[PDB]
């Protein structure tokens, strides 16, 4: 995945995945051009 940025942090980018994973301890995500940024960046 590539380092991606939700303003004035940063997180994971993931390739089209408007749903981020539940494995993770992700809190929030913004879309992205192509995919999604799920953050915090684990």
Do not use: E, M, Q, V
């Given at each position: 995945?590539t380092?991606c940025?939700?303003?004035?942090?940063?997180?994971?980018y993931?390739?089209?995945?408007?749903?981020?994973?539940?494995?993770?301890?992700?809190?929030?995500?913004?879309?992205?051009?192509?995919?999604?940024?799920?953050?915090?960046?684990?």
């Amino acid at each position: 995945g590539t380092a991606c940025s939700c303003g004035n942090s940063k997180g994971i980018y993931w390739f089209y995945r408007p749903s981020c994973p539940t494995d993770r301890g992700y809190t929030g995500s913004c879309r992205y051009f192509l995919g999604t940024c799920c953050t915090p960046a684990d």
